[PDB]
Amino acid sequence: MVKDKQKAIFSENLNSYIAKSEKTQLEIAKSIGVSPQTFNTWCKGIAIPRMGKVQALADYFNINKSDLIEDKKLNIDTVPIESGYTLEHHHHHH
Known about the structure:
By secondary structure, the chain is mainly α. The protein is built from 5 helices and no strands. It has helices at about 5-20, 25-30, 35-45, 50-60, 65-70. Helix 2 crosses helix 3 (about 35-45). The protein is elongated and about 50 Å long. The termini are far apart. It comes from Agathobacter rectalis (strain ATCC 33656 / DSM 3377 / JCM 17463 / KCTC 5835 / VPI 0990). This is SOS-response transcriptional repressor, LexA. It is classed as transcription regulator. The entry lists the keywords nesg, Protein Structure Initiative, transcription regulator.
């Protein structure tokens, strides 16, 4: 195919949030401040918007930009951080 994996991840993640909403792509596009054709290419993973729009997307969904950039490999694994941040543990014998 010769396709960039990052754009495939970004769209995959973004599309997840979009398809979880009942507002159309044309709806979200106006709220962000873009044209439907611009939003269409994002949803198809053809292009990634600039920081000003990526932040706008995350800001509108009340999420982190990191949620759109990093892969949905959401398997919690203890993350030592130099602060008083909350972390959870599972523990299952398998």
